[PDB]
């Protein structure tokens, strides 16, 4: 109950069947409010921010206690029960897609199925993996981070994004940079240092790996990935959308294929 106030959870909707949606890295559950509409009239919606969010008091990040993804597992876990949910269908972005993993090897009755949006589970490569990232351009990039928050977000936003949408852009911009620049900075030094490929195989619940184009921070081969080693029945939809926010930059169509994977 101080966790609901303090992470800005929200039930919304008219249905029956629960369906809770997690924003990821960069924003706040404000980058559903265009999902939304579409699964009002037949779902009830479970929304939260992530404790790192430009929309949460600061003084909750505890930088003592949020050093893995587990407190953040422990603080879904924390919410669902709160709210007496004991199943969902659960989409998470970005890292809500890990944190709703290592949270469905926790519970594995809670969730009947999970979406995963931009979801990757090692951003760094190694000799048989390929990620994305090299650690020594992403310690150019943290250093960057620090120096000059703003020019940091002004840079990144485009890329993130990906395809030429410039509101979605500006408001994920607008989000980022809502964010305290130290959080931001020691929540990607968590999940850069953050390797979820050992407990893929753990996940029994069947998993819908959304994959956009030219997404900057999945690489395709890591959605194949997800495909071969998660442990339950794994569904690729190859979205014929670009980049890592489809949420923010195509939401009629995103919603649409949303839907389409909680049907199956
Ligand atoms: C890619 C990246 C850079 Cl280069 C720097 C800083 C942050 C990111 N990203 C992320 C960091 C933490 C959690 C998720 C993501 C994501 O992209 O979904």
Not at 124 to 136: A, I, K
Not at 178 to 186: E, G, S, V
Not at 191 to 205: A, I, T, Y
Not at 230 to 244: A, C, Q, S, Y
Request: include cysteine.
């Amino acid at each position: 109950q101080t966790l609901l106030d303090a992470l800005n959870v929200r039930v919304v909707g008219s249905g029956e069947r629960v369906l809770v949606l997690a924003h990821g890295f960069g924003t706040d559950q404000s980058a559903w409010n265009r999902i939304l509409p579409f699964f009002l009239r037949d779902y009830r919606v479970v929304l939260y921010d992530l404790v790192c969010a430009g929309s949460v008091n600061p003084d909750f990040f505890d930088f003592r206690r949020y050093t893995t993804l587990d407190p953040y597992v422990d603080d879904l876990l924390h919410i669902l029960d709160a709210l007496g949910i004991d199943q969902c269908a659960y989409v998470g972005h970005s890292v809500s897609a890990m944190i709703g993993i290592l949270a469905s090897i926790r519970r594995p009755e809670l969730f009947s199925k999970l979406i995963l949006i931009g979801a990757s589970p090692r951003f760094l490569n190694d000799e048989d993996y390929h990620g994305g990232f090299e650690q020594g351009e992403i310690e150019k990039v943290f250093s960057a981070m620090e120096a000059n928050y703003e020019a940091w977000v002004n840079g990144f936003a485009p890329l993130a994004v990906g395809a030429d949408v410039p509101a979605a852009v500006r408001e994920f911009s607008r989000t980022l940079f809502n964010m305290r620049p130290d959080i931001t900075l020691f929540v990607s030094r968590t999940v850069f240092n953050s390797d979820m490929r050992g407990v893929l195989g753990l996940v029994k619940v069947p998993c819908h790996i959304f994959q956009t184009a030219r997404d900057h921070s999945v690489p395709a081969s890591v959605a194949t990935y997800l495909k071969n080693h998660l442990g339950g029945k794994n569904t690729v939809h190859w979205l014929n959308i670009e980049g890592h926010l489809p949420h923010l930059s195509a939401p009629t169509l995103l919603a649409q294929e949303l839907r389409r994977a909680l049907s199956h």
